[PDB]
Amino acid sequence: RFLKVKNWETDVVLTDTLHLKSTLETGCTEHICMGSIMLPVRTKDQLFPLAKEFLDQYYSSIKRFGSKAHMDRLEEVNKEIESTSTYQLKDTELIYGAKHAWRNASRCVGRIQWSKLQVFDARDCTTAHGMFNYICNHVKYATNKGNLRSAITIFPQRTDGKHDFRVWNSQLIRYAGYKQPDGSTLGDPANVQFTEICIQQGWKAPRGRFDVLPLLLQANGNDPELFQIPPELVLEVPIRHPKFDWFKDLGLKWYGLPAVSNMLLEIGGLEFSACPFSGWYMGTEIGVRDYCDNSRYNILEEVAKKMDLDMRKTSSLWKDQALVEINIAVLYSFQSDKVTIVDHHSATESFIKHMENEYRCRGGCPADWVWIVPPMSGSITPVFHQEMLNYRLTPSFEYQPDPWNTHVWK
Amino acid sequence: RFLKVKNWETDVVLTDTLHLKSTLETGCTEHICMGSIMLPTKDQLFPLAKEFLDQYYSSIKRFGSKAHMDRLEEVNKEIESTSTYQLKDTELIYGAKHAWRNASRCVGRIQWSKLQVFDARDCTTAHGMFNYICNHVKYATNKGNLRSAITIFPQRTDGKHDFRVWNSQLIRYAGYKQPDGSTLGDPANVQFTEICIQQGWKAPRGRFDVLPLLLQANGNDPELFQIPPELVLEVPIRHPKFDWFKDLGLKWYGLPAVSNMLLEIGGLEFSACPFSGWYMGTEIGVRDYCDNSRYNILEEVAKKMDLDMRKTSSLWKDQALVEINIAVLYSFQSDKVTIVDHHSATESFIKHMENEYRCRGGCPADWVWIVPPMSGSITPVFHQEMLNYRLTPSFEYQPDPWNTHVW
Numbered sequence: 170r171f172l173k174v175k176n177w178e179t180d181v182v183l184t185d186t187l188h189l190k191s192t193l194e195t196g197c198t199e200h201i202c203m204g205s206i207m208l209p210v211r212t213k214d215q216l217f218p219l220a221k222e223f224l225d226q227y228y229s230s231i232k233r234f235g236s237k238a239h240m241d242r243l244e245e246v247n248k249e250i251e252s253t254s255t256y257q258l259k260d261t262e263l264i265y266g267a268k269h270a271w272r273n274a275s276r277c278v279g280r281i282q283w284s285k286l287q288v289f290d291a292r293d294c295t296t297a298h299g300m301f302n303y304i305c306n307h308v309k310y311a312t313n314k315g316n317l318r319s320a321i322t323i324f325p326q327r328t329d330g331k332h333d334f335r336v337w338n339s340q341l342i343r344y345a346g347y348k349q350p351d352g353s354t355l356g357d358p359a360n361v362q363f364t365e366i367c368i369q370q371g372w373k374a375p376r377g378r379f380d381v382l383p384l385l386l387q388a389n390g391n392d393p394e395l396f397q398i399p400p401e402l403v404l405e406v407p408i409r410h411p412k413f414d415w416f417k418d419l420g421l422k423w424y425g426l427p428a429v430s431n432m433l434l435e436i437g438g439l440e441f442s443a444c445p446f447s448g449w450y451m452g453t454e455i456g457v458r459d460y461c462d463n464s465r466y467n468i469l470e471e472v473a474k475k476m477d478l479d480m481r482k483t484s485s486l487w488k489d490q491a492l493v494e495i496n497i498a499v500l501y502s503f504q505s506d507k508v509t510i511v512d513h514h515s516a517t518e519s520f521i522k523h524m525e526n527e528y529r530c531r532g533g534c535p536a537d538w539v540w541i542v543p544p545m546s547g548s549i550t551p552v553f554h555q556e557m558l559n560y561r562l563t564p565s566f567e568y569q570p571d572p573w574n575t576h577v578w579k
Numbered sequence: 580r581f582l583k584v585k586n587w588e589t590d591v592v593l594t595d596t597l598h599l600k601s602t603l604e605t606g607c608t609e610h611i612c613m614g615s616i617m618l619p620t621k622d623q624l625f626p627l628a629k630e631f632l633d634q635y636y637s638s639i640k641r642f643g644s645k646a647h648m649d650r651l652e653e654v655n656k657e658i659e660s661t662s663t664y665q666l667k668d669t670e671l672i673y674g675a676k677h678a679w680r681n682a683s684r685c686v687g688r689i690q691w692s693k694l695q696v697f698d699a700r701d702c703t704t705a706h707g708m709f710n711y712i713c714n715h716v717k718y719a720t721n722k723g724n725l726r727s728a729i730t731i732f733p734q735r736t737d738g739k740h741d742f743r744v745w746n747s748q749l750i751r752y753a754g755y756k757q758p759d760g761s762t763l764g765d766p767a768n769v770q771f772t773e774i775c776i777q778q779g780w781k782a783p784r785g786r787f788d789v790l791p792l793l794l795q796a797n798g799n800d801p802e803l804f805q806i807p808p809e810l811v812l813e814v815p816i817r818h819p820k821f822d823w824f825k826d827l828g829l830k831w832y833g834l835p836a837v838s839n840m841l842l843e844i845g846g847l848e849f850s851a852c853p854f855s856g857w858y859m860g861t862e863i864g865v866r867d868y869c870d871n872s873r874y875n876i877l878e879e880v881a882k883k884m885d886l887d888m889r890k891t892s893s894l895w896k897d898q899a900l901v902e903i904n905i906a907v908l909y910s911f912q913s914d915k916v917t918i919v920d921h922h923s924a925t926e927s928f929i930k931h932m933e934n935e936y937r938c939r940g941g942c943p944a945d946w947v948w949i950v951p952p953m954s955g956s957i958t959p960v961f962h963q964e965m966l967n968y969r970l971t972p973s974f975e976y977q978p979d980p981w982n983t984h985v986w
């Protein structure tokens with residue numbers, strides 16, 4: 170079956186066949202679309218088929234499908250599974266796997282970069298301190314003094330579900346949040362609960378507005394341990410405006426390395442519960458969401474005041490005006506400090522090219538419109554006008570419950 | 580099953596059961612989501628009619644009454660005898676209001692119950708249609724204090740006597756392909772603008788020429804008519820700070836009136852049912868003015884603002900967009916024409932959503948269409964999970980007439 174996708178701005182029409190290889194569910198039925206819903210131990214039985222599918226994809230990618238090497242590997246894996254219930258990926262299959270999980274991530278607008286990924290193999294790791302060392306190396310490599318390089322660190326896969334490796338932080342680098350008795354919040358509201366766990370675990374919080382959280386690492390299913398990231402490895406950017414000299418006095422700054430660390434990476438049926446990955450920021454992530462979401466730093470008013478905008482009536486679009494300037498400030502500050510960043514216009518334009526390329530060479534590109542379209546100036550970016558098809562391909566990155574909700578303390 | 584919807588900004592959670600009454604398909608499947616795709620017999624009729632009458636009588640607290648039963652049998656006998664039936668005025672009004680209530684792509688449904696319904700089922704000719712339309716335009720415009728309304732022409736019979744308004748909106752601007760290769764006016768209507776020519780209209784070849792109505796009655800060929808200019812309210816667009824803005828020579832009409840959709844009530848199909856409410860600022864300022872395939876004006880305004888358009892990262896497009904939208908809203912409010920900004924509109928929709936969830940068990944909503952084309956996340960609906968599904972009565976899309984008409 171063929172599925173047509175049309176861009177109402179260019180009239181360009183694409184044909185998708187890739188969706189035929191989609192196995193996982195979407196949450197939608199023939200009667201209801203849950204497209205805007207944020208989030209709607211395996212047995213030997215369902216393992217080999219998943220392994221076989223993957224290896225077939227892998228060997229086909231290297232143009233060795235059906236080869237003796239291909240058949241031996243399948244037999245090798247089958248034996249290993251039956252013999253140990255699981256199996257180990259070869260270094261090459263791991264790299265191929267990680268890259269495709271990224272390639273298949275429908276909510277990522279930066280996928281034009283999918284093939285350029287530095288994969289750090291941390292499968293020999295056994296302790297929390299070991300995890301800390303691998304993570305410090307990832308941050309330094311990826312940061313590269315501001316010339317960011319995409320990378321992912323992969324810790325030991327899940328076995329029986331009782332020896333999981335986990336990075337309790339949602340991002341390797343993020344600011345602490347503290348609830349005050351008066352009901353207000355100091356820092357980032359998004360990280361309040363995790364911050365409380367850190368404090369409870371022994372972290373001495375400096376209680377500021379931008380305190381870099383400590384890493385809480387869980388190795389081999391044991392209780393998590395606290396580690397502070399060497400400050401010299403944490404690249405930050407003070408935020409100032411190119412025309413508003415008072416902007417700098419707002420006291421805003423942000424970290425340069427976005428590193429999601431709470432997702433699960435699935436490759437050939439294997440589950441890697443600790444797989445922190447990083448690329449570089451698209452401006453709006455910080456300027457629109459982290460700074461202006463009512464439930465985050467929420468700086469729209471304070472910025473609007475300084476600009477002395479008519480905040481009496483929404484129809485003045487004061488919020489909209491303050492929003493643009495703040496985003497101008499983020500992009501300007503990063504570029505001035507020579508820290509990699511991309512604006513939403515460039516990022517979306519590149520994605521369209523990537524997407525068209527993918528339909529031609531791969532037969533499709535699963536994409537989540539709700540997530541791909543930027544949180545500001547939506548329709549003046551090409552993706553808004555692009556019809557998309559969302560489906561799940563493996564390997565892939567998945568959500569997983571926060572560890573503090575499932576962990577059995579020792 | 581009982582689905583839940585969460586707002587990630589307020590944590591509020593709502594349970595939806597109304598979806599369990601959905602009957603039509605969404606276009607999606609367990610394997611693929613097409614949420615962003617713009618457009619994914621007597622035996623057939625009675626069940627549809629029955630479903631409708633049951634909800635009608637249920638709404639009037641007479642479910643399972645003799646009146647209910649009587650009407651059910653009357654329509655039943657009517658369908659069996661005439662292969663169709665006629666809705667009572669009360670059922671027609673309830674149907675139209677609910678089709679609006681069920682329009683998952685409309686952000687202004689908090690106004691759903693306040694709709695003026697013009698019964699034009701006695702219309703027989705194009706002239707009659709022009710008269711009814713003129714009256715609708717005048718009633719809804721109301722000197723600037725816009726009032727929502729819909730005019731319902733005769734329902735389909737054998738598909739060969741369909742009533743159709745060929746325009747896509749009662750009031751729109753023409754578009755012409757110039758020698759330059761460029762487009763004069765609104766590119767979105769270039770094709771229709773030509774069918775009017777190809778039919779007789781004397782286009783003024785201007786940038787903002789109000790198109791002529793092309794009305795089709797009883798399947799006959801469509802006819803042209805000029806809407807009395809005195810009835811077409813327009814707003815000159817100026818900025819409340821950039822005196823140079825007026826020189827751009829921009830203006831827009833005050834009455835948004837979709838006229839190419841199909842109203843379905845109790846199985847019956849009303850192929851000519853123009854409806855109007857009032858504009859949300861962004862529709863004109865963001866989409867009609869800045870869409871690359873529309874008036875695409877960002878640059879001109881950008882140049883006149885003298886900002887660095889060398890690098891996309893200066894966000895000149897974003898700055899310019901905001902101003903163009905401040906101007907539209909300013910111009911309308913200044914001339915006293917009803918208009919709502921995206922902030923106020925989305926706030927009201929969230930309130931409506933909450934009312935709907937506690938009173939009807941849900942509210943079908945299309946997130947892709949509900950979230951404004953600008954400042955998405957600073958409006959509440961961005962953070963609101965929504966469930967999209969189809970409920971009848973409903974407003975549906977339908978093929979353009981010139982692709983089906985047999986002259």
Ligand code: HEM
Pocket residue numbers: 267271274276277278279280282286319320321429446447448449450451454511516540566
């Ligand atoms: C090179 C620069 C990259 C850019 C500019 C980019 C941009 C983005 C943005 C803007 C989002 C949405 C973030 C949000 O709303 O929270 C996103 C999500 C995502 N990206 Fe990328 N990305 C990049 C690199 C990567 C890399 C290296 C990977 C994986 C190896 C990746 C995996 C994903 C995934 C899985 C998501 C969804 C996360 C979630 O559900 O919260 N991205 N990306």
Ligand code: HEM
Pocket residue numbers: 679682684685686687688690694727728729837854855856857858859862919924974
């Ligand atoms: C009172 C003011 C109203 C406001 C502020 C409002 C606003 C909107 C907006 C912003 C859209 C999206 C327009 C687009 O992107 O093309 C829309 C679509 C729609 N509205 Fe409303 N609306 C109002 C009244 C009405 C009325 C009176 C009806 C029906 C009787 C209605 C039925 C619909 C339908 C069916 C659509 C989708 C049309 C399509 O698919 O192109 N609206 N409305």
Ligand SMILES: C[C@H](O)[C@H](O)[C@H]1CNc2nc(N)[nH]c(=O)c2N1
Pocket residue numbers: 205206207539540541587961962963964965
């Ligand atoms: C409810 C809705 O799904 C939610 O607010 C989504 C919308 N689009 C998004 N898009 C991106 N990139 N990131 C997000 O966190 C969200 N949040």
Ligand SMILES: C[C@H](O)[C@H](O)[C@H]1CNc2nc(N)[nH]c(=O)c2N1
Pocket residue numbers: 177553554555556557615616617947948949
């Ligand atoms: C391809 C995509 O569905 C398309 O551009 C949609 C997106 N959201 C929209 N939302 C509204 N209100 N109106 C539109 O015309 C669109 N166009």
Ligand SMILES: N=C(NO)NCCC[C@H](N)C(=O)O
Pocket residue numbers: 279340427428429447448449450451454455458459
């Ligand atoms: N660009 C990326 N990945 O490289 N973003 C990841 C999520 C970051 C998150 N949106 C933030 O603002 O912190």
Ligand SMILES: N=C(NO)NCCC[C@H](N)C(=O)O
Pocket residue numbers: 748835836837855856857858859862863866867
């Ligand atoms: N607000 C309404 N209806 O009341 N919009 C209907 C479609 C109008 C279309 N979006 C335009 O900008 O012309």
Ligand SMILES: [Zn+2]
Pocket residue numbers: 197201202203204607608611612613614
């Ligand atoms: Zn869907």
